[PDB]
Write a protein that binds this ligand. Sequence first.
Ligand SMILES: *C(=O)[C@@H](NC(=O)COc1ccccc1)[C@@H]1N[C@@H](C(=O)O)C(C)(C)S1
Length: 417
Amino acid sequence: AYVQRGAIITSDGVTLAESVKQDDGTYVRNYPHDGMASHTVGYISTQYGTAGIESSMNETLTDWRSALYSMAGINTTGSSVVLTINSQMQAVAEAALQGYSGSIVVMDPSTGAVLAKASSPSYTHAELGTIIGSQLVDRTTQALYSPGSSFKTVTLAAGIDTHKTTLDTTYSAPGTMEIGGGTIHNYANEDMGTIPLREAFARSSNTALAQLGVALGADNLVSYARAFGYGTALGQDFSTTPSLMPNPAEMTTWELAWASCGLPVGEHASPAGPQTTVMQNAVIAAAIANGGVVMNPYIVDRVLSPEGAVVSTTSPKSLGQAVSADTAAQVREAMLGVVESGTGMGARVPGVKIAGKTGTADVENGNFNSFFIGFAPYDHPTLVVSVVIEGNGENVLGYGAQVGGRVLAQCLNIQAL
Ligand SMILES: *C(=O)[C@@H](NC(=O)COc1ccccc1)[C@@H]1N[C@@H](C(=O)O)C(C)(C)S1
């Protein structure tokens, strides 16, 4: 502890972590704006473990002289870390989760840079010096959720990219339908008649999208999911638990039908899926917004020497092209429909074209979660949002979309400055 640890700063210059020298000789870790991006800034605690940047960039932040403790402070001084996080967007995301459990990720679609990353409930660093699904879980990257209908984005992308369907192709979308010996149902058993795929997607018909998933087959469904990041521990410089899909060979038709609507119901050796992180949902939206090119997200922009010189800069890196540019353009158009006339009207913001996909998924004892992935502006997107609002007793139907749209609009205004 005699070696001064480097600082952690936002892209807009807000210091979130500093080490301060003491007369004693040692350094104490200070956290200005304590409470901001806590899970991302992280900590090193005996009781609570290690997390975030303090942990992952520990060496950067962290010979004859080594044998002398009195000289530790002299030779080495840790380098600082500038994050991609913008403090104003981070504040926007934190304000939007007040009163709720869940998370939000805002990301640049062309690079995968994480501009805001918020999990709720959260905590302060002061609180770690006391006794405390807890606040410590990072719901953006280390909690897995059934994505529900937000995953239809992947089903749609795969259907179009394999040239098995088009947005104007019609589908029967009844209230209930037998598939693989089990029943699939639209929400509220709504019978929508025969409708084009773009409308089945905007209105989020499970019966229609399940039919597409069965037409694709398990290999295709899983393969496309993986091409968007499933099975990868996303993040160049932060830890994300991989999103999961089953071994396609173990899937049944009924399982496949539900999986295509974002509900993991499989029973077999491999995991049931899809199970997703919010960060993964953001990566999917970004890929779609970025002409199909998937980017490995990152949260460190650059590293600075104690003197203030740039030691290294992170380079954006692609995880591949999951779908063609033509496919991505069709998926974007379908997502515009979700917001302009479908289940995502709550995301609309006057004067800006926002596109996205909603989902709602049942969890334990009558609880359900609301999801939204989206991007803006529709034409030439410069931001992507991914949201989950956990209901845990409260009815949060459509909340993801409302939070998502509000966050995108506020972040676009910040970008314009
Ligand atoms: C996708 O998520 C869909 N979900 C369902 O039909 C199951 O939905 C619910 C579970 C619990 C409580 C209420 C609904 C279809 N898409 C949803 C969406 O948010 O887009 C939906 C509610 C419109 S139906």
